[model samples]
Target: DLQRAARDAAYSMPIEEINPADPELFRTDTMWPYFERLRKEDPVHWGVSPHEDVGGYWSVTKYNDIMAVDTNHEVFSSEPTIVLPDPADDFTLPMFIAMDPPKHDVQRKTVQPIVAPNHLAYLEPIIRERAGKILDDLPIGEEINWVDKVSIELTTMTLATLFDFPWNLRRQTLFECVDYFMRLWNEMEYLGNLILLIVGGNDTTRNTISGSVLALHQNPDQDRKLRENPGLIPAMVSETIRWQTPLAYMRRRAKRDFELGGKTIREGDKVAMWYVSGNRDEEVIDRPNDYWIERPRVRQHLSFGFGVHRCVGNRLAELQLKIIWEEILARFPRLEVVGPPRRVYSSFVKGYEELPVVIPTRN
Candidate 1:
């Protein structure tokens, strides 16, 4: 089926053209629609790495297939390489996201105790206070860019909590140090390791917040439905990830021969795990596009990914997101999107550039 579909969708060409490295790549309205179409037509289309560092990788678009690649490290191998072939240099420190088991597990576990589920409980009050302050300051009735005011601020402050970095230096540290890896990892051409962290992490959070809000606004009855049942917000978080589905795909290099969807994959081939497309598989989700907080497979959303390489900062991200929603709902009962929200420039990291919103305070 995939082989025929790949041919039908004309997957013979390089996939990079579909996802260029330019900042303008994400702004295109055609990306999602095209990906959705490709999911239906060519879920496992073998395509070349759009950037120069990598050669070619298989793009797994369907739910069952994406999971296969994500769960099977022996066949898929996250080690030796995680990114499809973006630029990297001596300065780049190999983070946990690019690692596999044994060493990957040890390094990840070293940092886990500081940010696990139990740790989140201790942080709730402090995170809640900061989130509350952000929501409280919103002016009622006028459209303000949530991207700048709320999401960016909340994410920046959250990172501060993680490192105990001085509040003033927190913003600068993110820009100077943490941000460089994202730019370096996603680089199609070498640019050293300089990057802007605030822009990288902040954009994804902004998109999740903005995308969820817009989706909520589009379905007013759903908004009313959740408001009446405040307990639903926790689950709404998962639904938001599924609905927006950030970060299109991650690549892994195959170490040996394997059979996927009945097709043979030879050694040393690249495979892309397309979480964005897989989250919307019709067979896997009852209503793939619609936001249902109680979806049977809600936790199955691969936004944070799966298996040994699941996102290291995922707990932090989710805790911060929950805090933001909790604080926003407690202080400002009604929040509405005032205009169209724009997607960011990167394909690997999908989210928003701006989200204009009008918040109404209970006071």
Candidate 2:
């Protein structure tokens, strides 16, 4: 029994320990401390739940282990399901995240060409113009919620580029579509081509922008460095991705029993790769706690994911961030966080619910 306990303990991560709804966790600078605890005590642990089909599964914390599962797409198939099931045995969507190669490839390629750097370049002028308007809307020294004023608006404009969507209706369509798909209990399903549009347009883009802003406020030194050296804007966005590590976890089910780091994972078990924690793995990143604008590995971070399931809209996300930073810095020399930012409540996706900021009077 002790040997059995030893094995389970070595790989145990009970769900009770991780409270996705913990309001405190979303508070200023709390999540990293919690994540550090897990990284130190248990790199790979099991999470259990009392709910029916909703029982939890393995949580991979280390960087190497995450790549192990993500890179081996055949053994850990994305098709079965992309997230853990709840106790009710009910789940939604046949979204692309729940697909493996072949099908995942075909669907990904359909929209991949549209978001490529060259593709988005055609729309850069419009994106910049829209971003400039958002910047101009901000009044110097006025208290405002940057999340809505900047992040949300930028994402909506970027989506407009993707679908050639009408700029006026883009925000509403995206909000409704995203709410329908994500508000699972509401059971508002988006079908046909609309499904493709929302997945690429809404979630990832929003998270990238909001998460980047929150991460900037969380690390003041890194922010100052970027401000002093404007050439680092592209790299700053990359570092934000590593620090924000948005999208807490992504799931893929095991196709067969496999021995990973001596733990036997059974077939059909959902594997939760916690990219948020893994992004801070000390082994891969130097001074993992310190945010560096010029870290060589920032661009190589796994937040956009790795291997076959890498984000298709990544280029668009980066471009939007670049454009937003360019316009904001050019207009307001001192763009700083005005209050304690808030993060959305969810284990699956990381987002800023509110980010308060005061724009300095234009120079």
Candidate 3:
């Protein structure tokens, strides 16, 4: 199998030579063994940049090490960028996720209420209806790209609602709002928060939705467990999120000199908290690679990250996935993956470009 082949290739490479951020490895879907080797050989490893846009950076592969850095924002600043590749000068946006301390907290607070417990509960039935409609509309016994037909459609609709966007009058509203709200809602903080909420929610949830299907299809026994006990839908959702880990890693810049895992991280150095790797750490999780639905503390994973910068819309994301799965179980007996998936071409957004699925007709 490819996994074994990749494992052999990874074992052959020297520890210092492994670059986890290589987009090709991700595109080819052989990055797992590279991380596996890193975790076992060098948990806090450093490597030179594969892209000229950024220099060398550190990789925190272990779960405990990642948690240490994620929670200690005081020593590790989030400014500049959060992905492995530093943004081009013109493309950088001052989003809250890339900010530290007071600034980060305040901006995050602006959007936090949108996904509060009360709001999520209110959005539950709305999400359920939408997901039900989406699944009900799918062509039974035919191959379809699940990523586009279901994932993006559902997420984009939810994004529109969250933004309270005036889609019909979008262009007009853009011009009018440009003239009217420039003074009131044009604060950089507000604008930054707006972009964060939209972009943050997009791939994170979209990919997870897509990931759930592939995860289930790959694990028929677990899928059978879910089908037999529909009440495990929430557990299934959490397990899929961990299994897929939509966002591969998040980068942080060191604020001052600090030592972690016997390595020093100097100020301004780029540090990647590899959530993708941390989720698979055997020290923190049991049978980390398996897609078991009933894993204890299933929600305890690094996909949403940790600390102040933890995903603000995590509950909403979970709520959306849970509702979709519930609706899916109600309508379809199984979602079958009929062919190889086309994964997204990026080291950052670990997602699918196309996942061919056929929903078998109900008996």
Candidate 4:
């Protein structure tokens, strides 16, 4: 496998030349050992982006180091933008509400409780209903792109404006958003928030669903464990979130001089908290690379990040995985991955762009 061969090249390379942010590594699924090398050799490795347009960044590879950076948002501000790239001229900074403070609090406070943990009680039935309908619509014994058919369909079920929009109509309602926003699209606020909200609701959860299929297909024993003991579904959901790590990392800028991992991040340097790397850090997690659902403290991973700006849709994401797997197991016993996964080419979103699968005859 290229993943294995990548380890040799990754380990043999000069430490300074390593750009863990390379999209090519992620696309080839060979980014694992690069992070592995950095974790062991340089926990806080300096990554010089290959693209001349982009500046260098600190790749926070270890778990504890990432936790330190993510929690202390006051020193490392999300303002201007959370991503490593400098906001382009047209990329309005203010509309990226997630990065703003007091205002972000006010906005998230209003929307948070709708999909809060307890609130999911009511949404469960709706999720189950949608899951059943989506599954029923799938063509059995046929090869299909799981990304489009099942993953997108299930996750796109209107959690974005859960209270305001009807569950059945968000798909339609979202179009009205696009239709209307297009008129005001030049106004950064309208289009920026629209892009944020739509992706917030759908993209991350969509890939995890696709990822769970690939993970289980690769780890037959874990899949066997899942089929035999359905109680592991919740644990499996969290484990999958950790293993797949739908979003690679959240980028932040150093607002001021902050010392971490025996190095200084001067004011205005780019810093990326690599959640995809941290989840597999050997120091914190036992057998960190293995995708076993039965692992202890199953939820103790940095898939969704932490602190004030943590993913708003994380709870909903987990619930969606749970209900879909619940319905999936009851209907089909196994999913066959008929081809290799096509991972997206972005250091920001570590997810599958395409996943081919065939659903065998039902149980």
Q: What lDDT score is found at residue 91 in candidate 4?
A: 38
CA-lDDT, candidates in order: 0.68, 0.71, 0.84, 0.81
Most TM-score-accurate candidate:
3
RMSD of 4: 3.0
Instruction: Please give the lDDT score at residue 116 for candidate 1.
Output: 78
lDDT of 4 at 124: 84
- Summarize candidate 3's per-residue lDDT along 128-150 as a digit string, tens digits: 77677767788998999999998
- The model with the greater lDDT, 1 or 4, is 4
Q: What is candidate 2's lDDT per residue for 49-162, written digit by digit as tens?
A: 454454768878888999999999889988666756632334445567677788777666666666677778888888899888867776787878877877777787777666
For model 2, give the 10-residue run with minimal summed lDDT.
Answer: 185-194
- Tens digits of per-residue lDDT, candidate 4, 1-363, equal 787789899989898888988889888889998899888888888878867646798999988999898888788778777667776665342454446666667566655666677878877887798789889889899999999988887776645334445444766776676656544533544455555655566668888899899999999999999999999999999999999988888888888998998998899888888999999987899999899899999989998888877877777777778988999999888799999988899887888878999998875
Q: Rank the candidates by lDDT, best first.
A: 3, 4, 2, 1
Clashes of 2: 3
Candidate 1 residue lDDT tens string, 85-156: 753564355555556677666665566676678877877898788777777777788888877877778877
What's every prediction's RMSD, in angstroms? Answer: 5.9, 6.0, 3.7, 3.0
Clash totals, every prediction? 4, 3, 1, 1
What are the TM-scores, per candidate, against the unseen true structure?
Answer: 0.82, 0.83, 0.93, 0.91
